[PDB]
Design a binder for these strands. Structure first.
Ligand code: MG
Ligand code: MG
Length: 58
RNA sequence: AGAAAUAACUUUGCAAGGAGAGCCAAAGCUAAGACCCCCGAAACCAGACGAGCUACCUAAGAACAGCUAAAAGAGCACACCCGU
């Protein structure tokens, strides 16, 4: 084929070369820094923030 | 001191079928990736431990000078007790 000819002049494939397909492994989000975490997205004081808002549909 | 589903979005496989039984299917299924904090009440209920402090009670013991007065929850006043 065409690509199979490309592989001949590249380095050997091994577990040091692999990669995920771009766009698959979305990066993670952690509350650290001035953007992600100062209130970590939970908003001002209120039962929204503490994780105590009424049941779904109240 | 940011743990996780329901959908959605992205990338793969296979595609009228997907999935290694059960499930879904009028382009859908299978897989992965992403997203939901920490400290703090007065309390409540159950079972234990406490009357060597203090409140009261029981058994058997102990103390209460001297003076005045004689059988009195008597007067002055030590030990003793209390705490204006
Ligand atoms: Mg996380
Ligand atoms: Mg006693």
């Amino acid at each position: 084929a065409r690509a199979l000819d490309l592989l001949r002049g590249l380095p050997r494939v091994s577990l040091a070369n692999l990669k995920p397909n771009p766009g698959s492994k979305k990066p993670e989000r952690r509350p650290r820094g001035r953007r992600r975490g100062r209130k970590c997205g939970r908003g001002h004081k209120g039962e929204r923030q503490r994780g105590t808002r009424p049941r779904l549909g109240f």
